[PDB]
Amino acid sequence: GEWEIIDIGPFTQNLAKFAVDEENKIGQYGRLTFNKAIRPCMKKTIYENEGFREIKGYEYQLYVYASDKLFRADISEDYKTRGRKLLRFNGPVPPP
């Protein structure tokens, strides 16, 4: 796997909103209201360990404000299926 920083544009906001929608499902923090994703945001790309460079999927580490509290979410995304899942949702944490 390899990590990069990526911008906080619409695609990232969607991921962050997706983290908040999943967490609301979970209910651990009660009812959260998505605010925005903020920098810094990281993306991991995972390959197959081969040499044909076959992408398996992706992982993201995001900072996200919901209900004016800052959280750190980890999301995974499958390359072929385009399905996503919320791995971890933590905080509140201090600003980076």
Binding site for Na ion (CB under 5 A): 35, 65
- Minimum distance between the CB of residue 90 and Na ion, rounded to whole angstroms? 17
- Minimum distance between the CB of residue 81 and Na ion, rounded to whole angstroms? 33
For residue 93, CA distances in Å to 55, 63, 71, 90, 96 come to 32, 9, 6, 8, 9
Name which of 61 and 67 has its Cβ closer to Na ion: 67
Name which of 14 and 33 has its Cβ closer to Na ion: 33
